[PDB]
Amino acid sequence: LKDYALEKEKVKKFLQEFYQDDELGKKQFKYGNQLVRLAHREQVALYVDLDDVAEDDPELVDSICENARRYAKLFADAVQELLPQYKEREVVNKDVLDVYIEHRLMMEQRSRDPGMVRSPQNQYPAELMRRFELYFQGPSSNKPRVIREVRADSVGKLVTVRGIVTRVSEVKPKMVVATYTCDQCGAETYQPIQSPTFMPLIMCPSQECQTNRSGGRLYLQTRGSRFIKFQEMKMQEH
Amino acid sequence: RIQETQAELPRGSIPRSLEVILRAEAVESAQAGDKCDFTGTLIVVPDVSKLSTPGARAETNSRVSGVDGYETEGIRGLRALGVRDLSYRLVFLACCVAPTNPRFGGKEEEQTAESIKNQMTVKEWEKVFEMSQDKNLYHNLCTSLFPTIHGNDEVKRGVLLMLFGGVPKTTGEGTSLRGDINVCIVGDPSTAKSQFLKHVEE
Numbered sequence: 001l002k003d004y005a006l007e008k009e010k011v012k013k014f015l016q017e018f019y020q021d022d023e024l025g026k027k028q029f030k031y032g033n034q035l036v037r038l039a040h041r042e043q044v045a046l047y048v049d050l051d052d053v054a055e056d057d058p059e060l061v062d063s064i065c066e067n068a069r070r071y072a073k074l075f076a077d078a079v080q081e082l083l084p085q086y087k088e089r090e091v092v093n094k095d096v097l098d099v100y101i102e103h104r105l106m107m108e109q110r111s112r113d114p115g116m117v118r119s120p121q122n123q124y125p126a127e128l129m130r131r132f133e134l135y136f137q138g139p140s141s142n143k144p145r146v147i148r149e150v151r152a153d154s155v156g157k158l159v160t161v162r163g164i165v166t167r168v169s170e171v172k173p174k175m176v177v178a179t180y181t182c183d184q185c186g187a188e189t190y191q192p193i194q195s196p197t198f199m200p201l202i203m204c205p206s207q208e209c210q211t212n213r214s215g216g217r218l219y220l221q222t223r224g225s226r227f228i229k230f231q232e233m234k235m236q237e238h
Numbered sequence: 239r240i241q242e243t244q245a246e247l248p249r250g251s252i253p254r255s256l257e258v259i260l261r262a263e264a265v266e267s268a269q270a271g272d273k274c275d276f277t278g279t280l281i282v283v284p285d286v287s288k289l290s291t292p293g294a295r296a297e298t299n300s301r302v303s304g305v306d307g308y309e310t311e312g313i314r315g316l317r318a319l320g321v322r323d324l325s326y327r328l329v330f331l332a333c334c335v336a337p338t339n340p341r342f343g344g345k346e347e348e349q350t351a352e353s354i355k356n357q358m359t360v361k362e363w364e365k366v367f368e369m370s371q372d373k374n375l376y377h378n379l380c381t382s383l384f385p386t387i388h389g390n391d392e393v394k395r396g397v398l399l400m401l402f403g404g405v406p407k408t409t410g411e412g413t414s415l416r417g418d419i420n421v422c423i424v425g426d427p428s429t430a431k432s433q434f435l436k437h438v439e440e
């Protein structure tokens with residue numbers, strides 16, 4: 001029904017020129033400052049308050065609360081596109097994942113061929129190279145729902161519930177992108193994980209191993225892969 | 239199935255058990271409760287133990303890739319590459335079995351006095367004979383078998399007799415007449431009851 005390029009421009013516009021007087025009355029760009037902070041890798045989570053979005057685009061807040069997973073992706077796309085122009089220095093590579101991102105970026109530049117059109121599969125998945133994560137803070141105009149009454153009519157919608165936490169698992173690594181290396185080629189293979197289970201890949205799909213028609217068995221490894229801190233809780237009605 | 243002897247256990251540990259394999263003529267040599275002494279070879283045996291992390295696969299070294307619609311992926315790809323887990327467990331393949339502490343030095347199907355007598359060396363049986371002719375053998379065995387226990391001579395005699403036992407018999411109608419002496423020791427704390435039991439058990 002709607003055009004997501006225009007929605008991405010809308011969310012870019014919101015992120016770039018929304019301001020508030022939070023800093024002791026001084027007018028700050030609430031989200032541009034954070035784009036700076038997480039372009040320099042000093043911040044991971046960006047909590048996009050939807051009350052701020054509603055100040056100037058309540059239709060956008062309605063669209064967000066009605067799909068809420070398309071728009072989390074859109075907001076992540078938009079912030080990922082805005083980060084390069086908010087970067088005012090060079091990240092200190094505080095992490096080990098950062099080294100993998102930097103090496104992948106540098107290799108991509110090195111073999112660029114800017115005008116050559118590469119295959120849709122011959123690219124880094126977005127999730128592999130983000131390092132930030134974007135979350136919504138529900139509009140206060142949404143009254144909290146009761147756990148019993150969150151049903152199939154609210155699948156895909158952003159809802160707010162409250163209850164007692166009864167049970168929390170331990171924090172453990174959830175695979176987001178499974179990275180493989182091959183025994184023939186030297187390319188990496190990426191398998192973004194959406195399901196609760198996945199079948200690990202066997203053969204590599206890289207260009208060289210297709211040209212050579214070689215075996216090209218690929219090996220799943222934790223070192224280049226993307227994990228996220230994962231935790232499952234049970235929450236209960238008041 | 240055997241397990242390591244209690245004089246071999248490290249601290250805080252449960253005895254390790256391994257399953258030993260007996261073959262053609264050694265096959266029925268070791269019975270339950272025996273402290274036996276197996277000579278043979280430690281071997282690996284393919285095992286079925288998974289759901290752990292996958293590890294140690296074996297696949298063909300032929301560089302082979304499935305075509306469109308027959309891609310070497312999933313169950314089909316694993317079957318086609320012939321991949322199989324390499325899981326092993328340790329088993330003992332025993333060629334010979336013998337007691338660790340043998341009773342005789344002469345031999346080891348049924349048991350008669352003459353069979354026992356042949357089963358032992360001439361020195362061992364001359365010893366057996368000379369204590370069988372030994373007057374005061376009752377007291378000699380009592381003292382030789384509970385050396386550290388003072389007093390309780392009646393208990394020593396009773397336990398010795400229980401060790402020898404009586405003659406089991408079966409009536410013509412069918413009832414069995416018991417021939418095993420059962421002995422109970424009742425007494426005050428620290429009167430060496432547990433010591434009597436330990437003496438017999440060792």
Ligand SMILES: Nc1ncnc2c1ncn2[C@@H]1O[C@H](COP(=O)(O)OP(=O)(O)O)[C@@H](O)[C@H]1O
Pocket residue numbers: 386387388389390425426427428429430431432433434
């Ligand atoms: N008549 C005895 N002669 C030698 N030792 C004795 C005697 N009575 C008790 N003891 C000693 O007392 C200790 C505890 O005896 P124990 O066998 O634990 O007694 P119980 O289990 O009957 O209470 C033993 O180590 C034993 O050496």
Ligand SMILES: [Mg+2]
Pocket residue numbers: 431432
């Ligand atoms: Mg006792």
Ligand SMILES: [Zn+2]
Pocket residue numbers: 182183184185186187204206208209216
């Ligand atoms: Zn390859």
